[PDB]
Amino acid sequence: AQNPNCNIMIFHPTKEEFNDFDKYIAYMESQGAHRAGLAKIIPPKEWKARETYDNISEILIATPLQQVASGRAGVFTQYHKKKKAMTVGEYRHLANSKKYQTPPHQNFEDLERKYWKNRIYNSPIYGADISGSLFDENTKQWNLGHLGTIQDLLEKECGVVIEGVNTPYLYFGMWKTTFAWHTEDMDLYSINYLHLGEPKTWYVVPPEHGQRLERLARELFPGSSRGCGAFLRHKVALISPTVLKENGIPFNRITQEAGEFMVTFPYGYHAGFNHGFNCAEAINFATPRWIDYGKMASQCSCGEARVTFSMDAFVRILQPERYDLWKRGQD
Ligand SMILES: O=C(O)CNC(=O)C(=O)O
Ligand SMILES: [Mg+2]
Ligand code: NI
Ligand SMILES: [Zn+2]
């Protein structure tokens, strides 16, 4: 078995190897990369996502989210308070203000210590989940707006044509902006490209050990657990590395820098935080290996998780028994 300790693997494809996206994912999996739940891909030196970032300031962040925490430093939830619209140039200036900017620090480890010590005492503002792309249309390789769609993958594997579309999302971050512990919708893959700015630190639980994280979460968030049998689908709970180590949960960590891709694998729980002003682009995708994960994915039916139009068909075809109850949650 390749990668039996479930370490995060880092790949350096050549420009020739960067042509065929599906083939390269399958290669990484041949080497055991999926066992970690997360992999890093450093693009060939010849590749670029676009020519410059000099003209992005007029993108609108229609609904910036202030991420307000409750709990203790290592075990907390966050809720998202909607703020007034602002442009990316206005958000960048905010991120760089004395109230929100990254503190002085020695290295990524010192910054990580400061994040876990102090996150709960601040409410950073995240421009998350913005439909759009920063890849140039002429970028042919690993262009997250030109991937094969999940609907087409389901159709190729299972023969059933379904409605729905699959487009990317932009994320504008600042110091302390936080992504809570989650797997993807329908336990899909994700791919995330850090276009510019400061790093993003990731934490990940191997897919084979995901249920250990779920059991800990039920213990740490006991009211939430009674409310919903899949409350991590709400994307609000944070647990620190120190707490995970105290409770014996297997996990790994890595920091993504500008110009790098990350792939999350089916049922790979992940969480993390931004170091400072940045912009990322991410999208879900599928492979043949995902289908069995999609069939088994948990679902929130309490009403909180509320997701996209396109998840309907995935539930309806892969999980027909759950469909009725899940759809009640959506309506
Ligand atoms: O970058 C973020 O805030 C969150 N991204 C992801 O969870 C992802 O790419 O799967
Ligand atoms: Mg612009
Ligand atoms: Ni994710
Ligand atoms: Zn729920």
UniProtKB/Swiss-Prot annotation:
GO molecular function: chromatin DNA binding; damaged DNA binding; histone demethylase activity; histone H3K9 demethylase activity; histone H3K9me2/H3K9me3 demethylase activity; metal ion binding
Subcellular location per the Swiss-Prot or TrEMBL entry: Nucleus
Keyword field: ADP-ribosylation, Chromatin regulator, Dioxygenase, Iron, Metal-binding, Nucleus, Oxidoreductase, Transcription, Transcription regulation, Ubl conjugation, Zinc
Residue numbers bearing the PolyADP-ribosyl glutamic acid modification: 16-17
Domain JmjC intervals: 136-302
Group of enzyme by EC: oxidoreductase
Residues annotated as domain JmjN: 8-50
Cofactor needs: Fe(2+)
Enzyme nomenclature, EC number: 1.14.11.66
Gene Ontology biological-process entries: cellular response to ionizing radiation; chromatin remodeling; double-strand break repair via homologous recombination; inflammatory response; positive regulation of chromatin binding; positive regulation of double-strand break repair via nonhomologous end joining; regulation of gene expression; regulation of protein phosphorylation
Binding-site positions, 2-oxoglutarate: 126, 192, 200, 235
Positions bound to Zn(2+): 228, 234, 300, 302
Main subcellular localisation: nucleus
Post-translational modification remark: Ubiquitinated via 'Lys-63'-linked ubiquitin chains. Deubiquitinated by USP14 with the help of TRIM14 leading to stabilization.
Known function: Histone demethylase that specifically demethylates 'Lys-9' of histone H3, thereby playing a central role in histone code. Does not demethylate histone H3 'Lys-4', H3 'Lys-27', H3 'Lys-36' nor H4 'Lys-20'. Demethylates both di- and trimethylated H3 'Lys-9' residue, while it has no activity on monomethylated residues. Demethylation of Lys residue generates formaldehyde and succinate.
Name of the protein described by the UniProt record: Lysine-specific demethylase 4D
Organism: Homo sapiens (Human)
Organism taxonomic ancestry: Eukaryota, Metazoa, Chordata, Craniata, Vertebrata
Segment of the intact protein contained: 11 to 341 of 523
